[PDB]
Design a protein around this ligand. Structure first.
Ligand SMILES: CC(C)[C@@](O)(C(=O)N1CCC(C2CCN(c3ccc(C(=O)N(C)C)c(Cl)c3)CC2)CC1)C(F)(F)F
Ligand SMILES: CC(C)[C@@](O)(C(=O)N1CCC(C2CCN(c3ccc(C(=O)N(C)C)c(Cl)c3)CC2)CC1)C(F)(F)F
Lengths: 15, 226, 226, 15
């Protein structure tokens, strides 16, 4: 996935 | 005609858009100038993510589509924010209400002239249009919601959302510029120039790999080829 | 409202738009397929040059600006002409009313999948809009008159000419789609996608350099890096 | 100039 390859962007979206 | 729903939406977008940075100063000064620019870019990515989360319809897309849209629109949105901060007199860009930089400052920060010139050329052209907060916020929303980005799954929904911002921009521009019907397509046509700027930035990212200049984790994630 | 002058201009563009090609078939078959596609591309460039010369304002620009415009818009205009010839049922493109090709045939002609998939995805997207001759002639004129192309001198005149075509498209589209105000910006937004395709095409030209596949003289002139 | 480097395209325009 793109999600597993974009951990920082993923974390910024989750917060 | 602007409807109450479009009016309310535009106002919320404008309100949503309303620090330990490496100081701007040899091999070390070049390294610190490069670091200063990468850190301003990180602050910009963080603000884009915060803004996108406030866009009606964005958080209803899968997280995978959210990442697909943000990964490739980030640079376009950053260059729109750059154009919004352009100073026509000194031909410079003011970052974070203080840090003013010109074409030579960008070169000193490790940027190749092949990228610096199109950024300043785009910023000059954008400044002539004299866009306000609402038009920049809507152009940013239109840029984010592009169904043609690589790896977008729900292309139909991304496109339906983009059409709501396009319609809101049209109705808004008709009030802001009631005697100039060309202002709305002129703003849309700037998204055409942003695609080229994005292509020129990719060449810049590839050049940094060649000169073994490493990008910080968040920028490497969204921009590097892994 | 569409003026008599815009009406006449559009109709003349439509009228203005209205041979030994290596036949389609081992290194011999591979070379012949590639030659077939490069030869169709040469025919397409020749037709674009002929149509560009009929565009009000084109021959008044300096010959140098005429070259700057055609050099960079050729591939976008070729991809719009390709999208116009798309068959949604068979997912193929019919060139010169007889030569029908799908994604596998494009691969057999030496194109890489990173270029083929976006051509076909753009073609599928364009077909959904269902543009007529008038709309295709106007989008082609808008694509040619882009002031942001590299090496353009008279940017002001090129932009002034572009706006005449944008205004005529707006007024034309308001008669063709009187109950859908989104049809006009949707067509303009296709010019954004075309810029990305032009960049994917430049990557394809680069890939041909690496595998020593040589483009014929006219294609090498407008596309190769010297 | 671009003209000197685009001889074929230049001839197509001239004809
Ligand atoms: C990061 C940078 C070293 C670089 O990687 C790059 O890709 N650039 C493209 C993006 C550009 C940024 C510069 C900072 N900029 C902004 C734009 C706006 C603001 C701002 O004032 N905000 C309130 C967000 C801020 Cl803090 C920064 C966004 C474009 C810097 C050059 C490189 F130039 F290629 F090296
Ligand atoms: C030519 C080809 C080997 C290639 O060099 C290339 O650059 N291509 C991009 C252009 C593309 C063309 C194919 C022909 N096409 C048309 C489009 C329309 C017509 C037509 O029917 N007309 C009446 C003009 C014709 Cl004859 C040709 C325009 C896109 C072919 C692949 C490669 F992709 F790099 F491989």
């Amino acid at each position: 996935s793109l999600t597993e390859r974009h951990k920082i962007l993923h974390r910024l979206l989750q917060e | 005609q602007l409807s109450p729903e479009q009016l309310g939406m535009i106002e919320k977008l404008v309100a949503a858009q309303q620090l330990r940075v490496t100081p701007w100063p040899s091999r070390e000064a070049r390294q610190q100038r490069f670091a200063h620019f990468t850190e301003l870019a990180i602050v910009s990515v963080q603000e884009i993510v915060d803004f996108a989360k406030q866009l009606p319809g964005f958080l209803q897309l899968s997280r995978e589509d959210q990442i697909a849209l943000l990964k490739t629109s980030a640079i376009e949105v950053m260059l729109l924010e750059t154009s919004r901060r352009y100073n026509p007199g000194s031909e410079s860009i003011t970052f974070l209400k203080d840090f003013s930089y010109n074409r030579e400052d960008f070169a000193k920060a490790g940027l190749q002239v092949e990228f610096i010139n199109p950024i300043f050329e785009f910023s000059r052209a954008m400044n002539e249009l004299q866009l306000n907060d609402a038009e920049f916020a809507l152009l940013i929303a239109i840029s984010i919601f592009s169904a043609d980005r690589p790896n977008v799954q729900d292309q139909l929904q991304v496109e339906r959302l983009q059409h709501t911002y396009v319609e809101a921009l049209h109705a808004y521009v008709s009030i802001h510029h009631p005697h100039d019907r060309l202002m709305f397509p002129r703003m849309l046509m700037k998204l055409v120039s942003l695609r080229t700027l994005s292509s020129v930035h990719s060449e810049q990212v590839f050049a940094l790999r060649l000169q073994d200049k490493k990008l910080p984790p968040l920028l490497s994630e969204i921009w590097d080829v892994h």
